[PDB]
Amino acid sequence: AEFKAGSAKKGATLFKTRCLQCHTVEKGGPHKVGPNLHGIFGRHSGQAEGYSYTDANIKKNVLWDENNMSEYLTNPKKYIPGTKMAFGGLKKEKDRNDLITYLKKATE
Ligand code: HEC
């Protein structure tokens, strides 16, 4: 919850190895198990058009920014209990800073 800009090149590799299994970043991109993440920053949770969220994700109603995204990705089910995101998180703050630096641009 204290994000500092990092390495987008590392962040992209992190996205492929840790996220791309369940997510896409491009505009008009397909949903997988998880939603497409285009426009995720500056948007309240649960609002990927065409995806069906849990009540936990919708009720959380979090306005995604770099800080709360970092806290979320540390341990998703702690931040949003009841969510179906079967993913334990990124514990290393440096990974989260890199990943989020990539996401902010990749979903822009
Ligand atoms: C499955 C194997 C997943 C992996 C690996 C990651 N994510 Fe995920 N994510 C997944 C699901 C099924 C969902 C929906 C959860 C629900 O309650 O409906 C999500 C959700 C997110 C969100 C929230 C989207 C929104 O509120 O609009 C974000 C921001 C997100 N996921 C990001 C994310 C990142 C950055 C990941 C790796 C670094 C990642 N997810 C992995 C399924 C899976």
Swiss-Prot record:
- What induces this protein's gene, according to its Swiss-Prot or TrEMBL record? By oxygen at the level of transcription. Expression drops rapidly when the oxygen concentration falls below 0.5 uM O(2).
Annotated cofactor note? Binds 1 heme c group covalently per subunit.
GO terms for biological process, alphabetical: mitochondrial electron transport, cytochrome c to oxygen; mitochondrial electron transport, ubiquinol to cytochrome c
Domain of life of the native organism:
Eukaryota
Pfam families, alphabetically?
Answer: Cytochrom_C
**Cofactor(s) demanded:** heme c
Which PROSITE patterns does UniProt cross-reference here?
CYTC
Positions modified as N6,N6,N6-trimethyllysine? 77-78
Positions of heme c binding: 19, 22-23, 85
Q: Which residues form the signal peptide?
A: none
CC per GO annotation: mitochondrial intermembrane space; mitochondrion
Bilayer-spanning residue ranges: none
Known post-translational modifications?
Methylation may enhance its transport into mitochondria. Methylation occurs in fungi, plants, and some protozoa, but not in animals. The precise role of methylation at Lys-78 is unknown, but it seems to preclude pro-apoptotic activity, possibly by lowering affinity for APAF1.
Family of this protein: Belongs to the cytochrome c family.
What does this chain do? Electron carrier protein. The oxidized form of the cytochrome c heme group can accept an electron from the heme group of the cytochrome c1 subunit of ubiquinol-cytochrome c oxidoreductase. Cytochrome c then transfers this electron to the dinuclear copper A center (CU(A)) of the COX2 subunit of cytochrome oxidase, the final protein carrier in the mitochondrial electron-transport chain. Isoform 1 (CYC1) is the predominant cytochrome c during aerobic/normoxic growth.
Q: What is this protein called?
A: Cytochrome c isoform 1
Q: Which organism is it from?
A: Saccharomyces cerevisiae (strain ATCC 204508 / S288c) (Baker's yeast)
Gene giving rise to this polypeptide: CYC1
